[PDB]
């Protein structure tokens, strides 16, 4: 009688009702957790809001898109992050 | 040699030892299940170059009808690196890991009758006792012993 | 008992060709495969002997029914040259003696042997195998074309 | 509805958009603040977002909530405190983690990881003798580890080698049964004490009869004089043992079993196999065969002495009998299948591997069901060696297919792993499934895969299932080949052959900045590698010959990066400098002899003049390089040279008699 683990993974996918935890004043913690979270959300928003006002040229972008073959989003990030110049952006993608 | 804990990113090559050493083969999802559920009791023996040379993949059998106990599923080492005292070190490291994490009352395994060296090593040196002879266990058609070992004296030696 | 590395072993279905390779070389005559089919189903009556966990010796035996008796004939002894008096003969020949005594319901044991190996018949007479028969021209292609028959009784 | 947002959380942890999963899990938090799975998700998220010092106090105030429940079981919060000590260990807060496990050491059930946490924090915070007591407790805990002994060495800080070996001598005294305390002094020690240590080591391991001791000693065969003194010691043992039946006539002990003679003959025969003189190895293994014909490992190294030599078929015919002695274990017929596949036999290896498998189907499909990567990749390399490509390309595609399956498998257990409480193995297997494709079997298959794709492109003639003759004849192999190559490029970069096959796969696509960045990422590791050097040679060869058929944007950056890394030289003097700085290395000499014909075909008389040197002062002169130089001579990359190759193989056969590729036809 050898099962080879057929019923070993069946009760992994079973249905059960999880336990209940008594509420005891978690708000004082989650206030400063939400304040820290809003701080890093403000920083991560400020990144794209300061780099959002960058002009985009089409021919150099399509030349880079032909010559190194990634998606348009990461190439747009790399071209907006290098002050609109093609040469040292190509050096940094080559580095 | 080296006996160390079951890091999961290692274990996906020790199945390569399984398919190279003992004929009873298992699914890999079994390995990813028993690499996360109880990571402490299974151990890996290596050499210097990072090549896998032996393993114990074990299991604590969950049975609420009686006391909780363990279940050794796989012990293997290569024949090119055998007769150095590997398998007994891996086995009693796994046994002391079980008795230090969740109090193994007894350990149990199943071993075929045709092999002699493994039968000898489980029989007299590491001191298993034959509890039941189960007929027609493996695929090739050999009857297997269902061996057990009592670990209460090991429990009271490690509890001191 | 202690310090020595001698253990006996059963002939299983997976260990046939090593028995082949030992008894092709221990004795100069060779017989066909039905010999090796006969040495299989007897169970614990035909076994081999490992010194330092490598195969050195072997004894296989048969059951005979002739000359108004119920007889046992050890088919072959197997051992090598550089291992003489170092772990083959005495202990597992006493093993075939004590399985013959733990059954104990039979009559005698006997053996055929060459005439040229006087050390062999000395080693057999150390346990009590007395000489009663000298058969002429028993071997078929070797130089000692004659043979001796040794025998002990049980009852 | 809650199941839709749980499904969204699982599909967003599937596709690895992290903060979207975070936003929809904070939707669970303002939906409900009491589930554990939110805190598990927070722990795994800011472990993989690498913010730790605030997660310290956050996991403290999660530990605060669960201590007051009366129906609670202990193992979950024990490993929760262990995961807390892990995240405070990687936080950099070292004293904070130290005082935390000193305060919550008694709320555990696992002594083990608490103990390694204390040991690592006592290694880190400069405290010496307490950490020495911790690692003595580990040596009494486990007598066998590299990391524990190395931590005790770098904690006690030995002044000289003698006080360093005092640790292993006292470890010999209280723990005589261990193995690596008898081994670790043989790594660094040199001299007469090293000789007298290895003397009693191999004396014990030959009296007891340990086979793989040579394997331990082939960790230390990189030195020259150690090999010579071991070989002189062993031949002194046998020249004393076949005269007066003991190791040496100075001492008087119990007389050894006569298996010791053939056992030391086995050891020295494999030693003569390693040092590369097979004639004495045969002259001693013949006496080893005539002593006893029945043990398996003697005929296994009888196969290995021919496998390390050239002729592979004699190893196969001896080793088939060697495994035909007994048919008990899968090891010896697995190596029989490997040796038959390297002996250019496919049907015998198939019927040999089909014995221990299940008898309900064929052998190759049965080992495909149980994911046997070894047999498939090795017979794919053997099928490449049979000079045709179809089912090897097929097997490469299905091994990458079950790689896709083993990278997709993880969806099933996350409900149980949010129902269970184990986190550090969970973050480690999420971390492995980020980087799962770095295993060396995948690279071992992918190198011959990319090699046969480029060889097929250079010289042309209910999911998807594969038949070889349609799937090997795709009209352009390069785009699917770079699709199979790009996880190997993105995930592992510390090995130069990944970027070198990236070079070889971009050479026929002509994307010059990808070309040059693969050049840079390969050059930043090794600069004196020969095959990379002729990659450089072809790079600036096509640069100086094709400096006009490219746009003006690529001109300036290519010229300034070439000014950065290269300068302004010609191929001829650069290959001259390269052949002079490697004027003793035979693969480098072949590597220069290739381009001394490639850059100009008229200098072919120099090329045979350059790659025919045979003196004993050459570095790395084995049968691999000699088979490589005859193979490269007959590949046509250097020239058609049937007037000197016969006398060169006749001269090489006198120095290597036991190779099949140097036999006279
Ligand atoms: C699921 C199961 O566990 S059962 C079904 C599958 N079972 C297995 O795979 C396990 C057995 N299979 C194997 O391939 C084995 O590992 C083997 C054949 C390589 C043997 O492994 P080894 O490395 O030799 O074990 P180990 O390192 O402990 O050997 C040393 C000790 O083993 C003991 N031993 C038992 N039998 C022998 C024997 N024939 N010869 C020598 N030593 C033996 C001795 O006590 C020896 O100590 P010693 O040096 O003082 O003599
Ligand atoms: O450990 P792996 O990477 O899986 O491969 C090794 C390695 O083979 P490769 O280096 O060619 O891949 C050994 O080759 P050597 O370096 O020892 O020459 C070989 O041993 P042999 O070829 O000499 O027989 C055998 O190692 P071992 O016998 O210790 O297991 C083998 O292991 P695998 O069978 O798992 O591939």
Residue numbers in the entry:
A (entry chain D): 35 to 129
B (entry chain C): 1 to 160
C (entry chain A): 1 to 155
D (entry chain B): 113 to 573, 638 to 841
Question: What do the study's own words say?
Answer:
To obtain a molecular understanding of how hNAA50 and HYPK can both bind hNatA, we determined the structure of the hNatE/HYPK complex by cryo-EM, which we were able to resolve to an overall resolution of 4.0 Å. While both hNAA50 and HYPK contact both subunits of hNatA, no direct interactions are observed between hNAA50 and HYPK. HYPK binds NatA mainly through interactions with the hNAA15 subunit of hNatA: only the α1 helix of HYPK interacts with hNAA10, while the α2 and C-terminal UBA domain (α3, α4, and α5 helices) of HYPK interact with hNAA15. However, HYPK-Glu103, hNAA15-Lys685, and hNAA15-Glu655 which form a salt bridge in the hNatA/HYPK structure do not show a similar contact in the tetrameric hNatE/HYPK complex. We speculate that the absence of this interaction might contribute to the slightly weaker affinity of HYPK for hNatE over hNatA. Interestingly, however, a key residue that stabilizes the hNatA-hNAA50 interaction, hNAA15-Thr406 shifts from in interaction with the carbonyl of hNAA50-Ala55 to a hydrogen bond to the hNAA50-Gln18 side chain in the tetrameric complex. In addition, while hNAA50-Asp53 and hNAA10-Arg83 maintain interaction as observed in the hNatA/hNAA50 complex, hNAA50-Glu7 and hNAA10-Arg116 lose interaction in the tetrameric complex. The overall overlay suggests that both the hNAA10 and hNAA15 subunits of hNatA shift in the direction that is away from the hNAA50 binding region to make closer and more optimal contacts with HYPK. To understand the molecular basis for this, we overlayed structures of hNatE and hNatE/HYPK with the common hNatA subunits aligned. This superposition reveals that the largest structural differences within the hNAA50 subunit map to the β6–β7 and α1–α2 loops, which shift such that the hNAA50 peptide substrate-binding groove is ~2.4 Å wider in the hNatE/HYPK complex relative to the hNatE complex. In addition, the hNAA50 β3–β4 loop is shifted in the direction away from hNatA by ~3.5 Å in the presence of HYPK.
